[model samples]
Target: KTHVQLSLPVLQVRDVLVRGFGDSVEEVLSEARQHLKDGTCGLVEVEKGVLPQLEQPYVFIKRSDAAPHGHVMVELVAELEGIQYGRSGETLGVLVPHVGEIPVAYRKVLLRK
Candidate 1:
């Protein structure tokens, strides 16, 4: 039997894209920078953990609220295995408040071969 485990935290934000503002990544960086400048974001913390026994681990992210009235953004970060071609893996993640487990694919696929 194979056991896949993922332990990571998800961050929720309003807008991830910053096209007209400036640059998406740059915009976020700027926010982070401003947070550092104004001392709002606060300090960074690191945590240590053991590895899980699995070949492939996957991570997913989704909205933590319902549709229409629920408009939320989320992001996930975790270590995965077997990302190469013809390889498989597994991942685990958590849903905040109202959101549930949703799968997010982060790989290349060749269809109609």
Candidate 2:
């Protein structure tokens, strides 16, 4: 696969609104913040409008380590929340791969012609 060198330069999560509540899907993201003394990445988790308020769902996180060259993949596992009947109460993302960057940052990664 095409690999590139990239560092998770910062992990200040902001504007991350999940459907339900659980542990921080990102412990590293937290570590990236708390890992550094007096260092903060501004990550915040907010819950959007979903009735029942608490699914007690697991906001699971799945990620890949940095490549030898450096690009990385930090993603969430939404399927972990299966539909009990015919509804998807789960959110697909707890943390998106790219944050604080404009949508232009996405043009190339997406394989569209």
Candidate 3:
């Protein structure tokens, strides 16, 4: 059986906002999980025109896997499958809203300190 949890990972880009989510958050999570299941990955946009100034170089992820919460950040380094990927580095990033400017990639490949 595969590991499953009641909680999911929340990708935090820069900062958290009050009106940051809607049903879209859940939908994006679904889309993201589906991509991973398909062995494919890419940024699942939370929305548009929300954070036009999001310029974070990395995206911090809050995972439900660790006690007291596990945190990780990802930066771009390589390009594959038309996706810019870098598991553990300081590099370029894109912009999104309260969800953060997260670059979608495989979790195992998106490790960092």
Candidate 4:
């Protein structure tokens, strides 16, 4: 089997909406991980008209660190309200404090075509 590098250069930031009702950054991240799974790679799943209003709120990728190779950390920032979620691209991402939703900076190593 071929092992690929986990952390890759920034491809481009894309906008995405997540689902959660976290009061703090920790809580939101805790919930996000369930869907995001390994920060390295995979499909990102967010709520859409499910759970409570909070399950459909906006958050930011305050900090994203891909180090030690295998494991990666994707921290989601909280801003409460004043943000909106709309249909967009295929990939996933989170909102920034003032920058809005951007694509995931790090792309997990995956099988090449």
Between candidates 3 and 4, the lDDT winner: 4
Q: Which prediction has the highest TM-score against the true structure? A: 4
Worst 10 residues of 1 by lDDT: 13-22
Q: Pick the candidate with the highest lDDT.
A: 4
Candidate 2 local lDDT, 35-106, one digit each (tens): 222321222222464223323333322243322223234333322245221122222223233334322121
Off by over 4 Å in 3: 4-23, 42-61, 66-113
Alpha-carbon RMSD, candidate 4: 12.2
Query: Per-residue CA lDDT of candidate 3, range 1-113, in tens?
Result: 13322222234433434222113333434444453345333232234552343322222233322222232233223322344433443332321232333333423323222
lDDT of each: 0.25, 0.29, 0.32, 0.36
Model with the higher TM-score, candidate 1 or 2? 2
- Runs off by more than 4 Å, candidate 2: 14-94, 97-113
lDDT of 4 by residue, 18-58 (tens): 33435555555455443343432222233453223334344
TM-score of each: 0.21, 0.22, 0.27, 0.29
The positional error of residue 98 in candidate 1, measured at the CA in angstroms, is: 23
- Candidate 1: tens digits of C-alpha lDDT, residues 1-113: 12112222232222111111122333433443333234232111122321221112322232232222222223232223433222222222211221222223222111110
